[PDB]
UniProtKB/Swiss-Prot annotation, chain A:
Glycans are attached at residue 1. The modification Phosphoserine is found at residues 148, 182. This is Glutamate receptor 2. The chain holds residues 413 to 795 of 883 of the full protein. The postsynaptic actions of L-glutamate are mediated by a variety of receptors that are named according to their selective agonists. This receptor binds AMPA (quisqualate) > L-glutamate > kainate. It comes from Rattus norvegicus. The M4 transmembrane segment mediates tetramerization and is required for cell surface expression. The gene is Gria2. It is found in: Cell membrane; Postsynaptic cell membrane; Postsynaptic density membrane.
Length: 260, 259
Protein backbone atom coordinates (compact mmCIF):
# COMPACT_ATOMS: atom_id res chain seq x y z
CA UNK A 1 0.00 0.00 0.00
CA UNK A 2 3.09 2.24 0.07
CA UNK A 3 4.22 2.03 -3.57
CA UNK A 4 4.19 5.44 -5.28
CA UNK A 5 2.27 5.46 -8.58
CA UNK A 6 4.22 7.54 -11.10
CA UNK A 7 2.29 8.87 -14.06
CA UNK A 8 4.51 9.81 -16.98
CA UNK A 9 4.41 10.08 -20.76
CA UNK A 10 6.22 8.33 -23.63
CA UNK A 11 8.25 11.18 -25.12
CA UNK A 12 11.87 10.78 -26.23
CA UNK A 13 14.33 10.96 -24.57
CA UNK A 14 12.38 11.35 -21.32
CA UNK A 15 10.59 8.00 -21.31
CA UNK A 16 11.21 5.45 -24.05
CA UNK A 17 10.60 1.72 -24.50
CA UNK A 18 13.86 -0.23 -24.27
CA UNK A 19 14.72 -2.22 -27.39
CA UNK A 20 14.08 -5.54 -25.65
CA UNK A 21 11.16 -4.18 -23.62
CA UNK A 22 9.08 -7.27 -24.47
CA UNK A 23 11.46 -9.52 -22.54
CA UNK A 24 11.44 -7.10 -19.62
CA UNK A 25 8.86 -6.08 -17.02
CA UNK A 26 7.89 -3.41 -14.52
CA UNK A 27 9.90 -0.21 -14.57
CA UNK A 28 12.69 -2.10 -16.36
CA UNK A 29 10.74 -1.91 -19.64
CA UNK A 30 11.48 1.82 -19.83
CA UNK A 31 14.59 4.00 -20.12
CA UNK A 32 15.26 7.71 -20.42
CA UNK A 33 16.00 10.96 -18.64
CA UNK A 34 12.81 10.80 -16.56
CA UNK A 35 13.16 7.10 -15.80
CA UNK A 36 16.57 7.97 -14.36
CA UNK A 37 15.23 11.03 -12.52
CA UNK A 38 12.48 8.88 -11.02
CA UNK A 39 15.10 6.46 -9.69
CA UNK A 40 17.10 9.32 -8.13
CA UNK A 41 14.08 10.95 -6.51
CA UNK A 42 12.81 7.64 -5.13
CA UNK A 43 16.23 6.93 -3.64
CA UNK A 44 16.40 10.38 -2.07
CA UNK A 45 12.86 10.26 -0.68
CA UNK A 46 12.95 6.59 0.26
CA UNK A 47 9.97 5.12 -1.56
CA UNK A 48 9.00 2.30 -3.90
CA UNK A 49 7.31 3.24 -7.17
CA UNK A 50 5.68 1.94 -10.34
CA UNK A 51 6.03 3.82 -13.63
CA UNK A 52 2.74 4.05 -15.55
CA UNK A 53 2.20 5.72 -18.94
CA UNK A 54 -0.67 8.22 -18.86
CA UNK A 55 -3.74 6.62 -20.44
CA UNK A 56 -4.86 9.43 -22.75
CA UNK A 57 -1.30 10.36 -23.61
CA UNK A 58 -1.99 14.00 -22.75
CA UNK A 59 -0.04 16.38 -20.53
CA UNK A 60 -2.81 18.26 -18.78
CA UNK A 61 -5.58 20.57 -19.92
CA UNK A 62 -8.88 21.68 -18.43
CA UNK A 63 -12.11 21.87 -20.42
CA UNK A 64 -13.51 25.41 -20.30
CA UNK A 65 -17.07 24.06 -20.06
CA UNK A 66 -16.88 21.17 -17.60
CA UNK A 67 -13.64 22.23 -15.98
CA UNK A 68 -12.51 18.59 -16.07
CA UNK A 69 -8.81 17.76 -16.35
CA UNK A 70 -7.21 15.19 -18.64
CA UNK A 71 -3.62 13.98 -19.08
CA UNK A 72 -1.11 13.49 -16.27
CA UNK A 73 -2.64 16.42 -14.38
CA UNK A 74 -5.99 14.63 -14.30
CA UNK A 75 -4.33 11.45 -12.96
CA UNK A 76 -3.05 13.46 -10.00
CA UNK A 77 -6.22 15.50 -9.54
CA UNK A 78 -8.59 12.51 -9.66
CA UNK A 79 -6.56 10.23 -7.38
CA UNK A 80 -5.16 7.99 -10.13
CA UNK A 81 -1.44 8.74 -9.61
CA UNK A 82 0.64 9.94 -6.64
CA UNK A 83 3.31 11.81 -8.60
CA UNK A 84 4.06 12.96 -12.15
CA UNK A 85 7.66 12.69 -13.35
CA UNK A 86 7.82 13.88 -16.94
CA UNK A 87 8.41 16.96 -19.14
CA UNK A 88 5.43 18.68 -17.54
CA UNK A 89 5.55 22.49 -17.68
CA UNK A 90 4.91 24.49 -14.51
CA UNK A 91 1.93 26.73 -15.34
CA UNK A 92 -0.52 29.00 -13.52
CA UNK A 93 -3.77 27.12 -14.14
CA UNK A 94 -2.07 23.83 -13.17
CA UNK A 95 -0.35 25.25 -10.08
CA UNK A 96 -3.86 26.05 -8.86
CA UNK A 97 -4.92 22.38 -8.72
CA UNK A 98 -1.64 20.48 -8.11
CA UNK A 99 1.76 21.03 -6.54
CA UNK A 100 5.00 21.49 -8.47
CA UNK A 101 8.60 21.22 -7.32
CA UNK A 102 11.07 23.93 -8.29
CA UNK A 103 12.18 23.29 -11.89
CA UNK A 104 14.35 20.27 -12.69
CA UNK A 105 14.84 21.58 -16.23
CA UNK A 106 14.85 25.12 -17.66
CA UNK A 107 13.57 25.77 -21.17
CA UNK A 108 11.48 27.98 -23.39
CA UNK A 109 9.43 27.89 -26.57
CA UNK A 110 11.73 27.88 -29.60
CA UNK A 111 11.76 27.89 -33.39
CA UNK A 112 12.60 24.82 -35.48
CA UNK A 113 13.32 25.28 -39.18
CA UNK A 114 14.61 23.13 -42.02
CA UNK A 115 18.40 23.27 -41.86
CA UNK A 116 19.71 25.24 -44.84
CA UNK A 117 16.66 27.50 -44.75
CA UNK A 118 16.77 31.21 -43.80
CA UNK A 119 16.94 31.95 -40.09
CA UNK A 120 13.57 33.05 -38.72
CA UNK A 121 12.61 34.86 -35.53
CA UNK A 122 9.18 35.05 -33.87
CA UNK A 123 8.96 38.67 -35.05
CA UNK A 124 9.82 37.62 -38.61
CA UNK A 125 7.19 34.87 -38.67
CA UNK A 126 4.42 37.05 -37.24
CA UNK A 127 4.81 39.44 -40.18
CA UNK A 128 4.14 36.88 -42.92
CA UNK A 129 2.32 33.71 -44.02
CA UNK A 130 4.32 32.30 -46.95
CA UNK A 131 6.14 30.32 -44.26
CA UNK A 132 3.46 28.58 -42.22
CA UNK A 133 4.11 27.98 -38.52
CA UNK A 134 2.25 26.27 -35.69
CA UNK A 135 2.41 24.35 -32.42
CA UNK A 136 1.33 21.07 -30.84
CA UNK A 137 -2.49 21.05 -30.94
CA UNK A 138 -2.43 20.96 -27.13
CA UNK A 139 -0.14 21.69 -24.19
CA UNK A 140 1.52 24.70 -22.55
CA UNK A 141 3.11 25.86 -25.83
CA UNK A 142 -0.26 26.41 -27.55
CA UNK A 143 -1.54 27.96 -24.31
CA UNK A 144 1.36 30.41 -24.18
CA UNK A 145 0.11 32.05 -27.37
CA UNK A 146 -3.52 31.97 -26.29
CA UNK A 147 -2.80 33.69 -22.95
CA UNK A 148 0.12 36.02 -23.80
CA UNK A 149 -0.41 39.78 -23.90
CA UNK A 150 2.64 40.50 -26.06
CA UNK A 151 1.66 42.10 -29.39
CA UNK A 152 3.92 39.92 -31.53
CA UNK A 153 2.69 36.71 -29.88
CA UNK A 154 -0.92 37.83 -30.04
CA UNK A 155 -0.50 38.48 -33.74
CA UNK A 156 1.01 35.01 -34.11
CA UNK A 157 -1.91 33.46 -32.19
CA UNK A 158 -4.54 35.15 -34.30
CA UNK A 159 -2.77 33.82 -37.40
CA UNK A 160 -2.34 30.27 -36.14
CA UNK A 161 -5.88 29.55 -34.96
CA UNK A 162 -7.14 31.13 -38.21
CA UNK A 163 -4.73 29.33 -40.57
CA UNK A 164 -7.20 27.40 -42.73
CA UNK A 165 -4.85 24.56 -43.53
CA UNK A 166 -4.42 23.74 -39.81
CA UNK A 167 -0.91 24.66 -38.63
CA UNK A 168 -1.27 22.65 -35.42
CA UNK A 169 -0.05 19.06 -35.01
CA UNK A 170 -1.02 16.16 -32.76
CA UNK A 171 2.51 14.96 -31.96
CA UNK A 172 6.11 16.16 -31.91
CA UNK A 173 6.80 13.57 -34.61
CA UNK A 174 4.19 15.21 -36.84
CA UNK A 175 5.63 18.68 -36.36
CA UNK A 176 9.19 17.54 -37.06
CA UNK A 177 8.03 15.55 -40.09
CA UNK A 178 6.16 18.61 -41.37
CA UNK A 179 9.29 20.76 -41.04
CA UNK A 180 11.43 18.21 -42.90
CA UNK A 181 9.30 17.98 -46.05
CA UNK A 182 8.02 21.54 -46.30
CA UNK A 183 11.39 22.79 -47.61
CA UNK A 184 11.39 25.82 -45.32
CA UNK A 185 7.68 26.51 -45.78
CA UNK A 186 6.90 25.29 -42.26
CA UNK A 187 8.49 26.39 -38.99
CA UNK A 188 7.58 24.35 -35.92
CA UNK A 189 7.25 26.06 -32.52
CA UNK A 190 8.19 23.74 -29.68
CA UNK A 191 9.94 23.62 -26.33
CA UNK A 192 13.68 24.21 -26.68
CA UNK A 193 14.60 20.92 -24.96
CA UNK A 194 12.86 18.86 -27.63
CA UNK A 195 14.22 21.17 -30.35
CA UNK A 196 17.74 20.49 -29.02
CA UNK A 197 17.15 16.74 -28.89
CA UNK A 198 15.86 16.42 -32.47
CA UNK A 199 18.80 18.53 -33.60
CA UNK A 200 20.97 15.73 -32.16
CA UNK A 201 19.25 12.92 -34.08
CA UNK A 202 19.37 11.69 -37.68
CA UNK A 203 18.71 12.78 -40.36
CA UNK A 204 20.06 15.94 -38.71
CA UNK A 205 18.16 18.20 -41.11
CA UNK A 206 16.52 20.52 -38.55
CA UNK A 207 17.88 23.20 -36.24
CA UNK A 208 16.89 25.60 -33.48
CA UNK A 209 17.01 29.21 -34.69
CA UNK A 210 16.91 32.42 -32.68
CA UNK A 211 16.41 32.84 -28.96
CA UNK A 212 13.51 31.42 -26.97
CA UNK A 213 10.17 33.23 -26.75
CA UNK A 214 9.93 32.69 -22.99
CA UNK A 215 11.48 31.05 -19.93
CA UNK A 216 9.68 28.17 -18.20
CA UNK A 217 10.58 24.98 -16.40
CA UNK A 218 9.50 21.37 -16.04
CA UNK A 219 8.61 20.30 -12.52
CA UNK A 220 7.69 17.14 -10.62
CA UNK A 221 3.99 17.32 -9.73
CA UNK A 222 2.05 15.84 -6.81
CA UNK A 223 -1.62 16.05 -5.82
CA UNK A 224 -2.46 19.32 -4.06
CA UNK A 225 -1.16 19.21 -0.49
CA UNK A 226 0.52 15.80 -0.75
CA UNK A 227 3.13 15.35 2.00
CA UNK A 228 5.40 13.87 -0.66
CA UNK A 229 5.74 17.31 -2.24
CA UNK A 230 8.23 18.82 0.23
CA UNK A 231 10.76 15.98 0.12
CA UNK A 232 10.55 15.79 -3.66
CA UNK A 233 11.17 19.53 -4.06
CA UNK A 234 14.27 19.37 -1.85
CA UNK A 235 15.48 16.32 -3.80
CA UNK A 236 15.27 18.26 -7.08
CA UNK A 237 17.30 21.17 -5.69
CA UNK A 238 19.89 18.76 -4.23
CA UNK A 239 20.16 16.76 -7.46
CA UNK A 240 20.62 19.98 -9.42
CA UNK A 241 23.21 21.41 -7.04
CA UNK A 242 25.20 18.18 -7.14
CA UNK A 243 25.36 18.52 -10.91
CA UNK A 244 23.46 15.28 -11.43
CA UNK A 245 20.66 16.90 -13.43
CA UNK A 246 23.27 18.25 -15.84
CA UNK A 247 24.92 14.85 -16.27
CA UNK A 248 21.49 13.36 -16.99
CA UNK A 249 20.82 15.80 -19.83
CA UNK A 250 24.26 15.28 -21.36
CA UNK A 251 23.71 11.55 -21.18
CA UNK A 252 20.36 11.52 -22.95
CA UNK A 253 20.98 14.47 -25.28
CA UNK A 254 24.61 15.00 -26.23
CA UNK A 255 26.63 11.94 -25.20
CA UNK A 256 25.14 9.82 -28.00
CA UNK A 257 24.56 12.74 -30.35
CA UNK A 258 24.53 11.66 -33.99
CA UNK A 259 24.88 14.97 -35.80
CA UNK A 260 28.39 16.00 -34.77
CA UNK B 1 -0.85 46.79 6.99
CA UNK B 2 2.02 47.98 4.79
CA UNK B 3 4.18 45.09 3.56
CA UNK B 4 7.89 45.48 4.27
CA UNK B 5 9.88 44.48 1.21
CA UNK B 6 13.59 43.88 1.65
CA UNK B 7 15.83 44.19 -1.38
CA UNK B 8 19.37 45.23 -2.25
CA UNK B 9 20.92 47.97 -4.38
CA UNK B 10 22.26 46.36 -7.54
CA UNK B 11 21.87 47.63 -11.10
CA UNK B 12 19.56 47.32 -12.89
CA UNK B 13 17.41 45.54 -10.30
CA UNK B 14 17.21 48.35 -7.74
CA UNK B 15 18.88 51.74 -7.97
CA UNK B 16 18.43 55.18 -6.48
CA UNK B 17 17.50 57.51 -9.31
CA UNK B 18 19.65 60.49 -10.24
CA UNK B 19 17.93 63.14 -8.18
CA UNK B 20 16.44 60.68 -5.71
CA UNK B 21 17.19 63.25 -3.00
CA UNK B 22 14.33 65.31 -4.47
CA UNK B 23 11.88 62.42 -4.02
CA UNK B 24 10.42 60.24 -1.27
CA UNK B 25 9.26 56.73 -0.45
CA UNK B 26 9.34 54.04 -3.11
CA UNK B 27 9.63 56.75 -5.80
CA UNK B 28 13.28 57.17 -4.80
CA UNK B 29 14.07 53.86 -6.49
CA UNK B 30 13.87 52.43 -9.99
CA UNK B 31 14.84 49.18 -11.68
CA UNK B 32 13.71 45.73 -12.76
CA UNK B 33 12.85 44.65 -9.20
CA UNK B 34 11.22 47.98 -8.40
CA UNK B 35 8.92 47.44 -11.38
CA UNK B 36 8.46 43.81 -10.35
CA UNK B 37 7.51 44.80 -6.79
CA UNK B 38 4.75 47.07 -8.08
CA UNK B 39 3.46 44.29 -10.37
CA UNK B 40 3.38 41.72 -7.58
CA UNK B 41 1.83 44.17 -5.13
CA UNK B 42 -0.96 45.07 -7.54
CA UNK B 43 -1.74 41.43 -8.38
CA UNK B 44 -1.79 40.44 -4.71
CA UNK B 45 -3.56 43.57 -3.54
CA UNK B 46 -1.16 44.90 -0.93
CA UNK B 47 0.56 48.18 -0.11
CA UNK B 48 4.30 48.02 0.46
CA UNK B 49 7.49 49.83 1.46
CA UNK B 50 10.84 49.18 -0.22
CA UNK B 51 13.73 48.74 2.21
CA UNK B 52 17.41 48.00 1.57
CA UNK B 53 18.74 44.98 3.50
CA UNK B 54 20.84 46.18 6.44
CA UNK B 55 24.04 44.16 5.95
CA UNK B 56 24.04 44.27 2.15
CA UNK B 57 24.04 40.48 1.86
CA UNK B 58 21.83 38.00 0.07
CA UNK B 59 21.60 35.20 2.61
CA UNK B 60 23.83 32.56 4.16
CA UNK B 61 24.04 30.82 7.52
CA UNK B 62 27.11 31.33 9.70
CA UNK B 63 28.51 27.82 10.16
CA UNK B 64 29.65 28.74 13.65
CA UNK B 65 26.66 30.67 15.05
CA UNK B 66 23.99 29.03 12.88
CA UNK B 67 22.54 32.49 12.24
CA UNK B 68 21.21 33.61 8.85
CA UNK B 69 22.34 37.01 7.56
CA UNK B 70 21.26 39.10 4.58
CA UNK B 71 17.76 39.21 3.13
CA UNK B 72 17.06 35.60 4.11
CA UNK B 73 17.84 36.58 7.68
CA UNK B 74 15.51 39.57 7.64
CA UNK B 75 12.74 37.21 6.53
CA UNK B 76 13.57 34.39 8.93
CA UNK B 77 13.95 36.70 11.96
CA UNK B 78 10.96 39.03 11.51
CA UNK B 79 12.39 42.18 9.93
CA UNK B 80 10.84 41.86 6.47
CA UNK B 81 7.68 40.39 4.97
CA UNK B 82 8.98 39.62 1.51
CA UNK B 83 12.22 39.76 -0.49
CA UNK B 84 12.15 40.92 -4.11
CA UNK B 85 15.70 40.82 -5.45
CA UNK B 86 18.03 38.70 -7.60
CA UNK B 87 18.01 36.05 -4.88
CA UNK B 88 19.06 32.59 -6.06
CA UNK B 89 16.83 29.66 -5.10
CA UNK B 90 19.04 27.12 -3.28
CA UNK B 91 18.55 24.02 -1.14
CA UNK B 92 19.74 25.48 2.17
CA UNK B 93 17.66 28.62 1.67
CA UNK B 94 14.57 26.68 0.56
CA UNK B 95 14.68 24.88 3.90
CA UNK B 96 14.15 28.07 5.92
CA UNK B 97 12.02 30.36 3.72
CA UNK B 98 9.43 30.01 0.99
CA UNK B 99 10.32 30.64 -2.65
CA UNK B 100 7.98 31.37 -5.55
CA UNK B 101 8.74 29.62 -8.82
CA UNK B 102 11.56 31.53 -10.58
CA UNK B 103 10.88 34.97 -12.07
CA UNK B 104 14.20 34.78 -13.91
CA UNK B 105 16.38 31.88 -15.09
CA UNK B 106 20.18 31.99 -15.14
CA UNK B 107 23.48 30.29 -14.48
CA UNK B 108 27.07 31.02 -13.51
CA UNK B 109 29.07 32.33 -16.47
CA UNK B 110 32.34 33.89 -17.56
CA UNK B 111 32.88 37.58 -18.35
CA UNK B 112 36.04 38.63 -20.15
CA UNK B 113 37.40 41.60 -22.05
CA UNK B 114 36.94 41.11 -25.80
CA UNK B 115 40.08 39.50 -27.17
CA UNK B 116 40.89 37.46 -24.06
CA UNK B 117 42.17 33.99 -25.13
CA UNK B 118 39.71 32.06 -22.93
CA UNK B 119 36.67 30.09 -24.03
CA UNK B 120 35.60 28.00 -21.05
CA UNK B 121 35.90 27.41 -17.31
CA UNK B 122 37.90 24.36 -18.33
CA UNK B 123 40.43 26.65 -19.99
CA UNK B 124 40.56 28.90 -16.92
CA UNK B 125 41.08 25.99 -14.54
CA UNK B 126 44.07 24.86 -16.59
CA UNK B 127 46.15 28.03 -16.17
CA UNK B 128 46.79 31.06 -13.95
CA UNK B 129 48.26 33.69 -16.27
CA UNK B 130 44.68 34.96 -16.48
CA UNK B 131 43.37 35.35 -12.94
CA UNK B 132 39.69 34.80 -12.20
CA UNK B 133 37.40 35.12 -9.22
CA UNK B 134 33.92 35.83 -7.95
CA UNK B 135 31.97 38.07 -5.61
CA UNK B 136 33.31 37.65 -2.05
CA UNK B 137 29.82 36.54 -0.97
CA UNK B 138 26.70 34.99 -2.47
CA UNK B 139 25.69 31.78 -4.24
CA UNK B 140 28.20 32.22 -7.07
CA UNK B 141 31.08 31.99 -4.60
CA UNK B 142 29.33 29.15 -2.77
CA UNK B 143 28.99 27.14 -5.97
CA UNK B 144 32.78 26.78 -6.09
CA UNK B 145 33.39 26.59 -2.34
CA UNK B 146 30.89 23.76 -1.90
CA UNK B 147 31.57 22.03 -5.22
CA UNK B 148 32.83 18.44 -5.31
CA UNK B 149 33.39 18.42 -9.07
CA UNK B 150 37.05 18.12 -10.12
CA UNK B 151 37.14 21.05 -12.56
CA UNK B 152 35.32 23.43 -10.19
CA UNK B 153 37.27 22.17 -7.17
CA UNK B 154 40.51 22.98 -8.96
CA UNK B 155 39.12 26.43 -9.71
CA UNK B 156 38.21 26.95 -6.05
CA UNK B 157 41.50 25.65 -4.62
CA UNK B 158 43.14 28.18 -6.91
CA UNK B 159 40.81 31.03 -5.98
CA UNK B 160 40.92 30.72 -2.18
CA UNK B 161 44.71 31.03 -2.16
CA UNK B 162 45.33 33.28 -5.19
CA UNK B 163 47.76 35.78 -3.67
CA UNK B 164 46.46 38.94 -5.27
CA UNK B 165 42.92 38.33 -4.02
CA UNK B 166 40.77 37.33 -7.00
CA UNK B 167 37.53 38.09 -5.14
CA UNK B 168 35.60 41.34 -5.53
CA UNK B 169 33.16 43.08 -3.18
CA UNK B 170 30.70 44.19 -5.83
CA UNK B 171 29.65 43.55 -9.40
CA UNK B 172 30.93 47.02 -10.32
CA UNK B 173 34.31 46.04 -8.86
CA UNK B 174 34.53 42.77 -10.77
CA UNK B 175 33.57 44.52 -14.00
CA UNK B 176 36.10 47.33 -13.55
CA UNK B 177 38.77 44.72 -12.85
CA UNK B 178 37.97 42.90 -16.10
CA UNK B 179 38.06 46.14 -18.10
CA UNK B 180 41.27 47.36 -16.49
CA UNK B 181 43.21 44.09 -16.36
CA UNK B 182 44.34 44.10 -19.99
CA UNK B 183 42.83 40.64 -20.48
CA UNK B 184 44.45 39.08 -17.41
CA UNK B 185 41.23 38.77 -15.40
CA UNK B 186 38.09 36.74 -16.01
CA UNK B 187 35.09 37.46 -13.81
CA UNK B 188 32.66 34.64 -12.87
CA UNK B 189 29.10 35.92 -12.34
CA UNK B 190 25.41 35.18 -12.88
CA UNK B 191 24.60 35.13 -16.61
CA UNK B 192 21.85 37.75 -16.48
CA UNK B 193 24.26 40.30 -15.03
CA UNK B 194 26.88 39.26 -17.61
CA UNK B 195 24.27 40.03 -20.29
CA UNK B 196 23.56 43.41 -18.72
CA UNK B 197 27.16 44.65 -18.54
CA UNK B 198 27.50 43.55 -22.16
CA UNK B 199 24.90 46.21 -23.02
CA UNK B 200 26.83 48.94 -21.21
CA UNK B 201 29.60 51.20 -22.53
CA UNK B 202 32.40 50.94 -23.35
CA UNK B 203 31.02 47.65 -24.70
CA UNK B 204 34.37 45.93 -24.16
CA UNK B 205 33.20 42.82 -22.32
CA UNK B 206 31.72 39.52 -23.44
CA UNK B 207 30.40 36.20 -22.17
CA UNK B 208 32.25 33.05 -23.27
CA UNK B 209 31.20 29.43 -23.12
CA UNK B 210 27.96 28.21 -21.64
CA UNK B 211 26.79 28.53 -18.06
CA UNK B 212 28.17 26.28 -15.32
CA UNK B 213 24.73 25.57 -13.89
CA UNK B 214 21.03 26.29 -14.34
CA UNK B 215 19.00 27.93 -11.60
CA UNK B 216 16.56 30.76 -10.99
CA UNK B 217 15.74 33.75 -8.81
CA UNK B 218 12.62 33.60 -6.68
CA UNK B 219 10.50 35.90 -4.54
CA UNK B 220 11.01 34.89 -0.92
CA UNK B 221 8.67 35.08 2.08
CA UNK B 222 8.94 33.83 5.67
CA UNK B 223 8.28 30.11 6.09
CA UNK B 224 4.54 29.46 6.21
CA UNK B 225 3.60 33.07 5.35
CA UNK B 226 0.10 33.45 3.92
CA UNK B 227 1.61 35.70 1.26
CA UNK B 228 3.44 32.86 -0.50
CA UNK B 229 0.65 31.32 -2.59
CA UNK B 230 -0.62 34.62 -3.98
CA UNK B 231 2.93 35.73 -4.76
CA UNK B 232 3.83 32.51 -6.58
CA UNK B 233 0.71 32.64 -8.76
CA UNK B 234 1.37 36.32 -9.48
CA UNK B 235 4.90 35.51 -10.69
CA UNK B 236 3.66 32.70 -12.93
CA UNK B 237 0.91 34.93 -14.30
CA UNK B 238 3.31 37.83 -14.97
CA UNK B 239 5.69 35.42 -16.71
CA UNK B 240 2.99 33.80 -18.84
CA UNK B 241 1.60 37.21 -19.79
CA UNK B 242 5.04 38.31 -20.97
CA UNK B 243 5.57 41.13 -18.48
CA UNK B 244 8.68 39.53 -17.01
CA UNK B 245 10.22 39.46 -20.48
CA UNK B 246 9.09 43.05 -21.11
CA UNK B 247 10.87 44.16 -17.93
CA UNK B 248 14.02 42.28 -18.93
CA UNK B 249 13.95 43.92 -22.37
CA UNK B 250 13.22 47.30 -20.80
CA UNK B 251 16.17 47.40 -18.40
CA UNK B 252 18.62 45.38 -20.50
CA UNK B 253 18.00 46.28 -24.14
CA UNK B 254 15.68 49.26 -24.68
CA UNK B 255 18.08 50.96 -22.25
CA UNK B 256 21.13 49.32 -23.85
CA UNK B 257 24.16 51.43 -24.79
CA UNK B 258 25.85 49.13 -27.31
CA UNK B 259 23.67 49.48 -30.40
N1 LIG C 1 5.36 20.42 -21.51
C1 LIG C 1 4.01 20.71 -22.11
C2 LIG C 1 3.81 19.83 -23.34
N2 LIG C 1 4.57 20.25 -24.54
C3 LIG C 1 5.62 19.48 -24.90
C4 LIG C 1 6.41 19.73 -25.96
I1 LIG C 1 8.01 18.49 -26.39
C5 LIG C 1 6.16 20.97 -26.79
O1 LIG C 1 6.83 21.28 -27.77
N3 LIG C 1 5.09 21.71 -26.35
C6 LIG C 1 4.23 21.45 -25.24
O2 LIG C 1 3.33 22.18 -24.94
C7 LIG C 1 2.92 20.59 -21.03
O3 LIG C 1 3.26 20.35 -19.89
O4 LIG C 1 1.71 20.69 -21.47
N1 LIG D 1 22.01 35.81 -6.60
C1 LIG D 1 23.10 35.55 -5.60
C2 LIG D 1 23.96 36.80 -5.48
N2 LIG D 1 24.77 37.09 -6.67
C3 LIG D 1 24.38 38.12 -7.45
C4 LIG D 1 25.00 38.48 -8.60
I1 LIG D 1 24.31 40.08 -9.73
C5 LIG D 1 26.18 37.64 -9.08
O1 LIG D 1 26.82 37.87 -10.09
N3 LIG D 1 26.49 36.61 -8.24
C6 LIG D 1 25.85 36.24 -7.03
O2 LIG D 1 26.22 35.29 -6.38
C7 LIG D 1 22.52 35.02 -4.28
O3 LIG D 1 21.31 34.84 -4.19
O4 LIG D 1 23.39 34.85 -3.35
Amino acid sequence: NKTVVVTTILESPYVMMKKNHEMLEGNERYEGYCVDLAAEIAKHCGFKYKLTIVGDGKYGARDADTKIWNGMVGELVYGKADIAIAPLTITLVREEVIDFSKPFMSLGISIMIKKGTPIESAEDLSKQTEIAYGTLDSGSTKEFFRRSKIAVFDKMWTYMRSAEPSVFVRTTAEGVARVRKSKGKYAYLLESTMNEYIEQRKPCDTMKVGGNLDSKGYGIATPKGSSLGNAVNLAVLKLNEQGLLDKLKNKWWYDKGECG
